[PDB]
Every structure is written in C-alpha cells, then in structure tokens.
C-alpha cells in the first residue's frame, strides 16, 4: 500500500551548511523526486513557504533530470512534468532547455500564496459572482469550494513528509488535507532517504 | 514554558473494544481535562470528527467532575466551563444537573462541522452581504476572514495532541493552526498520560 499522491514540505537552510542554500533546496527536491519515482508514486507536491522552487524552475528541471539519471541510468530517465498551478504552467522533461511519452511523475510546486491567500481570493470571487447575480448564495456548497480549490491548487495528498525536527505546516494549503497522514521524525533536520523510507513504511502499515 | 491553548484530537474506538465506544471517548476526554488542569493550562479544545462529545454533554460534564475529584479531592474540584462554539452554548460546572467562582479551565468541543463546512458558511454569509451591498468585495480580506473564523470557531491552539499512530487532522478546523505545534507517537494507539506528558515536555524543549 503506497500513497497515490505524495507531498513534501521543504525548508531552505543556511548556504554555509553542507548542502544548504537555494542550490541545496533544489538538490533536496530532486532527491525526493527520484525517491518518489523509484517507489512507483506518480504524483508529488513540493512545497516551500516563500516559493523558491517556483522561482527556480529551469535549474530545478535540470537537477531533476541529473538525479534521475543517477538512479535510472542516463539512457532511461523517466519522463516527468513540473507544474505551477497558480500560473497554469507545465514543463515536460528538458523541453525548451536542452507511448514512450507517458509521464512517469507529475510534480506540482506550491508556496504560501497557494494556501490561505488563495482561499480568501476564492471567497472574494464567489461574493463578486453573487453580487452580479451569476451565483446563488445557496449554490455556494462544499462541493463547489472543493472542486474550485482542487482545480486552483491540486488534489489532496495521501501522505505528507516533513524533514525538520518539529512539524511546521508553514502555510501548506490547508483545505485538501482532510485525511492526509503526516510523517516526521523528532530528531531529524535533513532531507535524507532513510526518513523518506520510514515514512512510506509507516504509511504502508509496517512496525 | 506550557502552551496557553491546548488542543487534542480524539478518535472513537469500536464499541466492543476495551475502553471503546462513547463511554471510552468520554473517559478519555475527562482524563485529558484533568491532566490539562493539573499542568496549569486554562484553555482546552477537544475535537472528534462526528461531534460525539457535543451529543453527550451531560455525561461528559459528570465525568469531568468525577475525574477532577479523583485528582484534586472531592472538596477542591476546580471550576470548569464546557463551551460549544457551533451552537454558542456554554455550561458551568454541574449547574443544571446537581474569586471562588473563577474558571480554572474552559473546554471547547469541536467537530468536523466547525472546520471546512464553517468556512463554507462564512463564504455564504459574506456573499449574501456583498449581494445586497452591505459588504464591499474590497473588504473581504485576510484580516476579515481571520477575525470571523476566530470568532466563529476559536483562537489558534499552541499545541495539538494526537493519540493515534499516524497524525491525521481528520477535519480539525484548518484555518487557525498556522503556528500550532503537533505531537503524537508513532507506536501509540491509546489516550494515556505518558504520551500527554511527553508532548508537553517536547513543547517546552526538554531533553
């Protein structure tokens, strides 16, 4: 039993630390991508509070390709797509940078603006639609808000991994985490494979 | 350093299991109340998805008194209030059942209805007022949503305790948990004092 949809919250760390800074953040993201693909998981959400990932997409796409080549061999890089929901942008493989076209993993990049701020914007949108008589107040339902936020932000993750010592959601979109299970480790302060693996084992039902 | 505001998510167990059912839930709730008062914490949110606690308020109130008498002696039961935000009800001590009037702990009972469905309710309220121009769309802001949900549901908890093995918020009101700290134990599947205490020690920063 593996999650169909995986999420991870990443934190940027001092550049003087080993594997820190923005480059370190992108490397951590690409490690998580390779681990997720290796586990057979086809949907991944990566979140960081300020949107560093969203502002470094070219470098991220190159790091993902490089890391996938390390795990799968340079001739067998799984196909991937990187999506930014709030701009409706999607990027495939290294198209534009550098059957057998099926996407092995789709990676969505999220930040704080995609959470509460997006819900406030949605409430304004629905109020404006009611004020111009295009939406009945009684048609504002859970199903409508659900489907709107699913389109604006994305579907709910089954499991969310956090690699710091104390769970801090730090703005992660709070609507579609009704049943999401969270995993982290009390000591941990680094993005390392053994924590990823223990999180999946916990989700699966191991001891 | 103790949290000023404590939350606990409770799960109901099979009615046939040992310490299960509604009786088991109420005993767990009243234990957490006694432990919280003993630690000096004056604000407690108790959440269960279906609102079982809200449907069993008389018995809960009795159990709280009974359990407090066990911890403090029958002659020194701290004063307590049980509040239900969704219905705007509040009950003091055993009034109506059976300085020296100061409330030692206020216990709020929450359920899934207090979470996303309440955000939908708020969206409908704002949409209706916007539709008759009692509310400008420009005034639908983060500050407004923050204050409305704080009034409808309650303030943000500093620490949230979960007594199952994999943290699942299961509908806990998601807006005002921005900086909330979360605690649970990977092995655990029962409401026991040692998990409560280890959670408070983690929050404090102990070794």
- CB count in 10 Å sphere of residue A73: 9
In a mutational test of the A interface, the residue from B120, B128, B139 whose CB has the highest number of chain A CBs within 10 Å is B120
The vertex-A41 CA angle with A39 and A44, nearest 5°, equals 125
Contact B52, B25 (CB under 8 A): yes
Residues on A contacting B at a C-beta cutoff of 8 Å: 116-117, 119-120, 122-124, 126-131, 133, 135, 137-138, 140-142, 145, 166-169, 171, 174-175, 177-183, 186, 202-203
In a mutational test of the B interface, the residue from A116, A123, A126 whose CB has the highest number of chain B CBs within 10 Å is A123
Question: Going by C-beta distance under 8 Å and a sequence separation of 6 or more, which residues neighbour residue B78?
Answer: B37, B68, B72, B104, B105
Is B169 in contact with A183 (Cβ distance < 8 A)? Answer: no
Contact A68, A80 (CB under 8 A): yes
A88-95: long-range pairs with CB below 8 Å, 24+: A91/A57, A91/A61, A93/A61, A93/A65, A94/A61, A94/A62, A94/A65
Give the span between the Cα atoms of B78 and B41, in whole angstroms.
Answer: 12
Contact B21, B11 (CB under 8 A): no
Give the span between the Cα atoms of B146 and B152, in whole angstroms.
Answer: 10
Cα dihedral A118, A119, A122, A127 sign? negative
- B21 token code pair: 């059912």
Give the span between the Cα atoms of B144 and B150, in whole angstroms.
Answer: 10
Contact B83, B109 (CB under 8 A): yes
Give the span between the Cα atoms of A103 and B158, in whole angstroms.
Answer: 42
Q: Between A21-38 and A193-204, two packed helices, what is the crossing angle to 10 degrees?
A: 40
Give the span between the Cα atoms of A68 and A62, in whole angstroms.
Answer: 10
> Number of folded domains in chain B?
1
Domain region containing A120? 1-207
In the beta sheet, which residues pair with residue B183?
Answer: B161
Cα dihedral value B63, B162, B80, B13, nearest 10: -20
Listed in order, strand segments (DSSP E) in chain B are: 5-9, 43-47, 80-84, 89-92, 105-110, 159-162, 181-183
Give the span between the Cα atoms of B49 and A92, in whole angstroms.
Answer: 41
Q: In B, which residues are within 8 Å of A183 by CB distance?
A: 166-167
Question: Going by C-beta distance under 8 Å and a sequence separation of 6 or more, which residues neighbour residue B73?
Answer: none
Contact B50, B12 (CB under 8 A): yes
Q: A166: helix, coil or strand?
A: coil
Cα dihedral A18, A22, A27, A28 sign? positive
Give the span between the Cα atoms of A142 and A139, in whole angstroms.
Answer: 9
């Amino acid at each position: 039993k593996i999650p169909k949809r995986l999420a991870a919250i990443l934190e940027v760390k001092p550049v003087g630390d080993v594997g820190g800074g923005v480059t370190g953040l992108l490397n951590d993201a690409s490690e998580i991508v390779a681990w997720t693909v290796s586990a057979g998981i086809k949907h991944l959400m990566l979140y960081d509070y300020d949107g560093i990932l969203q502002r470094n997409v070219p470098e991220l796409r190159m790091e993902i390709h490089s890391n996938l080549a390390k795990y799968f061999g340079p001739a067998h890089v799984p196909n991937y797509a990187v999506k930014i929901p709030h701009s409706n942008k999607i990027f495939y493989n290294l198209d534009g940078i550098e059957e057998k076209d099926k996407i092995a993993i789709e990676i969505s990049l999220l930040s704080n603006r995609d959470g509460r701020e997006t819900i406030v914007d949605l409430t304004k949108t629905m109020a404006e639609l009611a004020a111009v008589n295009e939406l009945s107040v009684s048609d504002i339902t859970m199903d409508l808000v659900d489907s709107e936020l699913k389109q604006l932000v994305g579907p709910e993750p089954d499991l969310l991994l956090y690699f710091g010592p104390s769970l801090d959601l730090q703005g992660f979109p709070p609507w579609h985490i009704r049943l999401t299970e969270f995993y982290w480790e009390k000591d941990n302060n680094e993005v390392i494979y053994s924590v990823f693996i223990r999180g999946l084992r916990q989700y699966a039902g191991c001891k």
